[PDB]
Design a binder for this molecule. Structure first.
Ligand SMILES: Nc1ncnc2c1ncn2[C@@H]1O[C@H](COP(=O)(O)OP(=O)(O)OP(=O)(O)O)[C@@H](O)[C@H]1O
Length: 577
């Protein structure tokens, strides 16, 4: 016997409707308080004699974006449209039908409601349980790729509900209630302790079950093994005011990695992995050392004394042949090459929350790092400790950021050493710093510092030729990193290899004029390629012929659609200043 099997889904939607149309935050909260309170009174009425029953059946429909039990619905609003058209017998070429089908972004539920309103007169039949039953069935049949059984499940949902129930059903499926009150507000009204508990278990059900009585608190809410906690986040930081931000004492600068944030929970032969939103990615990485794309290659990297631990880090795609991490944005397909063994998952770890019996959240950052060094012996390309150093200078933070960008990382992290780990709070001890479009030509290259492959390109601008003429002279403007973080850079290097020529300071080429800075090798401009380069500003320089250069230059794309003679010019450079 359960409450949701007794409460009409209609009661829920009335409350949702009463909430949405309310202007003030106070009136909004009030309708929900009212709903929560009747649920509670009835539960006690129901369970006097009796429990695992809880508010969850409703809570999961009220904060549907926090659903974690039920997988994706795989329902497209077009299906809904076509379905309603067939169902309601609407003229397939009329305004209603077309409004639904060609919906962009007064949302889809509103449009459906206004079509349903004069046409659907039924009162609802479903209980909150039944709706939940029906949604289960939709998610399940989506996983099975059974469209007929989704259609049929939607059918039971729709024809058994009222128009308003249908409006909210849709929002519950799209996972956007548009209520006008934050989820944090909702949790606060539900329980003093809800929000905090959810931050250490991304799980509505435990939230509701464990905090069913509003007057019983939990004494020690903490990160538990195999419970998904929300990751600690980093605050945006101004470079000019960083020393103060770090309280004028010594701090950590750590590499900022652009990958999939992931937590690993390990107890002996047993593994779980959770993403930033508390989704279970174990099947991918491996539950056991005999299964997965990662666990088997790292299981034996854990030191002898280590039975249980919890790590925080970034999953990267690593290329063994070039010893590089692959960035998110590429014309190529990371998800499939990783599967095809041209690439491999590498876990890049920057924090530990527990080891064996002890819980580390309230340890200072310094101690967790110290501990981290004793959990496993790193394996390059599978599981690494993130590169970091100790610093105290604004200049240092600048030097680190240049170095990061040159190596094609997105930025750097700055972290205060005494800081504890605060799940889902952004800032505190953790800061992130990122930099804060030219089409120019590659005219030279460098090896060393990377590998074979090139570490950097020397790039230049065109001196505007006579009319009818292609350019013949180039002025160097900037070095830039060419680490193969994307396959197109890899491909470029191989296309370009036949063209490199030794650069001689004592007898340079007439086509490329250099400043103090000299390439090891150059390339005749006609044989080369335009790169599109992102840069923060143009700053003075003696190293390059232009008398200026690019701060934080990154290559965005290779412009194979342009021609070498289409290079931006000194004059093009003038205007950018
Ligand atoms: N070394 C690290 N320590 C802590 N958090 C990190 C680290 N590296 C990456 N992150 C996480 O990644 C986020 C990166 O910031 P942002 O999204 O602006 O950069 P990005 O590289 O373009 O993004 P992505 O990392 O998703 O590609 C941060 O919020 C942080 O939570």
């Amino acid at each position: 016997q359960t409450v949701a099997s007794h409460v009409p889904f209609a009661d829920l939607c009335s409350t949702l409707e009463r909430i949405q149309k309310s202007k003030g935050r106070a009136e909004k909260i009030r309708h929900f308080r009212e709903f929560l309170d009747s649920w509670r009174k009835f539960h006690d009425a129901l369970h006097k004699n009796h429990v695992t029953d809880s508010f969850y059946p409703a809570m999961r429909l009220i904060l549907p974006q926090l659903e974690r039990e039920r997988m994706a619905y795989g329902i497209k609003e077009t299906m809904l449209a076509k379905l309603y058209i067939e169902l309601l017998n609407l003229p397939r070429d009329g305004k209603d039908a077309l409004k639904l089908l060609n919906y962009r972004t007064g949302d889809f539920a509103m449009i459906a409601y206004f079509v349903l309103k004069p046409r659907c007169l039924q009162k609802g039949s479903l209980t909150i349980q039944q709706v939940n039953d029906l949604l289960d069935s939709i998610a399940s049949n989506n996983s099975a790729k059974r469209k007929d059984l989704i259609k049929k499940s939607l059918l039971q949902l729709i024809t058994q509900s009222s128009a308003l129930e249908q409006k909210w059903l849709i929002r519950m499926i799209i996972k956007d209630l548009k209520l006008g009150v934050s989820q944090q507000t909702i949790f606060s009204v539900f329980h003093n302790d809800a929000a905090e508990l959810h931050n250490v278990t991304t799980d509505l059900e435990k939230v509701c079950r464990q905090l069913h009585d509003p007057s019983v608190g939990l004494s020690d809410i903490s990160i538990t093994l195999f419970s998904a906690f929300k990751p600690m986040l980093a605050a945006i930081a101004d470079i000019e005011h960083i020393e103060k931000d770090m309280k004028h004492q010594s701090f950590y600068i750590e590499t900022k990695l652009d990958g999939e944030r992931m937590q690993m929970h390990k107890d002996g032969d047993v593994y779980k992995y959770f993403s930033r939103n508390g989704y279970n990615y174990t099947d991918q990485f491996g539950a056991s050392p005999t299964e997965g794309s990662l666990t088997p290659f790292i299981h034996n990297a854990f030191k002898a004394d280590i039975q249980i631990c919890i790590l925080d880090g970034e999953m990267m795609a690593y290329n063994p042949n070039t010893q590089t991490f692959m960035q998110k944005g590429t014309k190529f397909d990371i998800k499939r090459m990783v599967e095809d063994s041209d690439l491999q998952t590498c876990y890049c770890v920057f924090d530990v929350l527990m080891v064996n019996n002890k819980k580390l959240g309230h340890e200072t950052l310094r101690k967790r790092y110290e501990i981290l060094s004793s959990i496993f012996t790193p394996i390059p390309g599978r599981i690494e400790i993130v590169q970091k150093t100790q610093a105290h200078t604004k200049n240092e933070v600048i030097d680190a950021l240049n170095e990061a960008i040159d190596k094609r990382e997105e930025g750097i992290m700055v972290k205060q050493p005494l800081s504890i780990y605060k799940p889902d709070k952004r800032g505190e001890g953790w800061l992130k710093i990122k930099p804060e479009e030219l089409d120019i030509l590659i005219v030279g290259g460098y090896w060393g510092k990377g590998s074979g492959m090139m570490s950097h390109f020397l790039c230049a601008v065109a001196e505007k030729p006579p009319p009818g003429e292609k350019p013949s002279v180039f002025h160097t403007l900037s070095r830039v990193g060419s680490g193969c973080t994307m396959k197109e850079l890899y491909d470029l290097g191989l296309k370009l290899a036949k063209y490199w020529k030794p650069f001689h300071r004592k007898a340079p080429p007439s086509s490329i004029l250099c400043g103090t800075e000299k390439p090891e090798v150059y390339i005749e401009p006609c044989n080369s390629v335009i790169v599109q380069i992102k840069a923060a500003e143009i700053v003075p320089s003696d190293m390059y012929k232009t008398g200026c250069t690019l701060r934080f230059p990154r290559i965005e794309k290779i412009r194979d659609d342009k021609e070498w003679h289409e290079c931006m010019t000194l004059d093009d450079l003038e205007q950018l200043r």
